[PDB]
Amino acid sequence: NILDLFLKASLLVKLIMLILIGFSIASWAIIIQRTRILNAAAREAEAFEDKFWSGIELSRLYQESQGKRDNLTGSEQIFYSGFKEFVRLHRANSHAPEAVVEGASRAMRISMNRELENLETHIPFLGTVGSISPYIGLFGTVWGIMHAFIALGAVKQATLQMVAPGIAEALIATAIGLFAAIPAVMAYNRLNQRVNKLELNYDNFMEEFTAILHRQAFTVS
Amino acid sequence: ILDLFLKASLLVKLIMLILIGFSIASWAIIIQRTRILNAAAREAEAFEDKFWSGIELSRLYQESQGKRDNLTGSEQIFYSGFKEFVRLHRANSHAPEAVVEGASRAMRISMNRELENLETHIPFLGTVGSISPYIGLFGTVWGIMHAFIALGAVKQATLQMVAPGIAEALIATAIGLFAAIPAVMAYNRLNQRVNKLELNYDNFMEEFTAILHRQAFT
Amino acid sequence: ILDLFLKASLLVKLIMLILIGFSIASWAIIIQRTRILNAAAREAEAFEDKFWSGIELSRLYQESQGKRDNLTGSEQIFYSGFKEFVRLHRANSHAPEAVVEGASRAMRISMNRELENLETHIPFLGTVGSISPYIGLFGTVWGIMHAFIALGAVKQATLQMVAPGIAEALIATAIGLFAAIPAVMAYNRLNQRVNKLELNYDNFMEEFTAILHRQAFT
Amino acid sequence: LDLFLKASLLVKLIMLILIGFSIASWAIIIQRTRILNAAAREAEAFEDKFWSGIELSRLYQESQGKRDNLTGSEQIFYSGFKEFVRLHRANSHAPEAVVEGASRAMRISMNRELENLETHIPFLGTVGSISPYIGLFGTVWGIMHAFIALGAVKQATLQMVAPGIAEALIATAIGLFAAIPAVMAYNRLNQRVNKLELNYDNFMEEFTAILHRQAFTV
């Protein structure tokens, strides 16, 4: 079978298996955990955005979110810090409406950057696994081939037949190195497209919200 | 084909059934999407003619009510915009300065809903066209292990015991290519049809918004 | 070299004709588009040199009238915006923006159909550059299978009898890459030239809209 | 060199095009590197000189005193200030139209700067991505001449297979050498341009903000 050759394959191939299995284990744990998180965030974004765009009064929608101020997410957290600093700066004296709306828009901007940074946290590691896993597999096969040609260089009468398993146990390190790389690289691209689409949703919401605050502030004049 | 598949090792059974099962699924998706992307383009021009006929948008919205349950494509953008516009400017007369961004959202959400209904299986073709060749390589690597285990059993090797391991590798590669060719040919052809039909539906984004901004401010 | 084509299995010679067909079609498209984008770019430069001469638009408009059957590119989007402006500025005009928002719409409905009058056959190259190595590899893998089908009936085998079959099979990968490389280079090159030309037309129509808002508002 | 004198005609062409792409890539690396260093240094020098507290109209008057070859952050400022001051001469404008007229000019001028930095970067990315596959096509061509020799005589000589091997192997050597310059430099230069874009975009916010305060107070 495979296992009764693998148990007697070189120590270097044992290490290259434990390394590549470790990255395959880890990358799939990220793919599971970072797809569940993005499914939750993309749903909580649109399920807040309609609620806000229902035409219900923004002040009470803010006030009712105070009962979960410690637990906010995504668009609701982006709205909450923007509205909190808006009402503070508008309650404060001696601030012109163009400075009030700036302060709200910035307290929104930095909260939106902090939501996206909290959203994407482990994604750079998939970029690592998809980049090194082929090269770790290739080092596994190149060391195996090199050690086979050294062994073949030792005998008085050389033929490829006596190093055939040395070449075979080298070549599969390419294959498992590549099969640990595929899930990671295709999912790194896919999850970045999902983050960029969800960033564009928050960017759009930040423009729609700062537009209504701009008019709301200047209407008091 | 079946002459060697009848005696192939158990993992090849799965790899063959998966890799031909993508081909079949890919062809089924091309048939479904090539109906839709062609009917959702025809029903765009068949809205534009009626729209530019000079009939009132009031009459368009009224005659649309009798088919709102199945309303699709460009007219479902229009209806969603006009429904919310009426609810914010005519069912309540307040704030004509504020309805235009409401109508802009009401077309924006309808747009994303309609494009999502066109895209439903397009990303899957993108995975089949990317992954099918690697499933071929996995079939090859396994067939090559069946070659080397048959080679190690004899003092002097020859093609005679190696041939079934080679035949296994090549047929897995050939099926992997046969599933990939339709997928990566059609994925770009359909993904351009969606981008074209999106830029067609975007012909509302200024036009409808300016008409309902004029209807609010006049 | 036709000796192999004269004797090889029906599928590998059919694949040879498909790949030569893509190679011919690709090189014809490369020379064609290149001549069309060279013309369109020089015609944009010539219209910029006219527009920046300080000529009054109301007389520049009259110049195009002389060529209503041959308007293109920058001068087509100018003409379509301005032929709407005269109308929106005549009689009912709403706000100075309402006459420059309807004119800018009448430009962008000719941004499309100047783009997509160029940019026509570029997505074909995008498919040829993608599938041409896979078609070459499928012809190659079928070639190895055809060689082993002839070989495996004999009690022994050697490179002297299988190597000619493999050499005639690898032609399909070689032609597969020879048809693919010109397509991937020219697809990227031409697609960047279209994005540069689109940016130029968008820069023109926005900057023209500033002069148009200056003349509408003051 | 006699080893290249009798090389196959296809390999002659592959050497000329790959050495051509290597030489053209090194010329682009050094050319774009001196340009991006100069542009990054000019931005740092000007934006300091501007933010020093010197009067904008005096700075603009000596900047017009150097309107010859103004390209850089100078040209970006000049374009924004020129349409600000010129549009301000017409007191009928509300201040929103004045900050529009400034940001309308400078966004155009920023894109006209970036397209002068960018010019040969997408060619270098085209070469770096296709170059090893031109090498691979040359290698597959050499592999065929090797298998043809192994199919000629009952015991082929090393001397008669060697031309196919040497052509095959050199085509991989040069395919690597003509890819090293592009794979280090393309990401480095594209990141440099993205950083220098972010510098001008920070200047867009900072300069339009002071003009917004100016327009709301003059």
Partner: peptide, 25 residues
């Protein structure tokens, strides 16, 4: 964007490589 995917060539090379194992004296 579009590029040249060559991955199934690894297989052709694995097969062609094994013919030399199957024929070495």
């Amino acid at each position: 964007k579009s590029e040249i995917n060559i991955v199934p060539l690894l297989d052709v090379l694995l097969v062609l490589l094994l013919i030399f194992m199957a024929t070495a004296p």
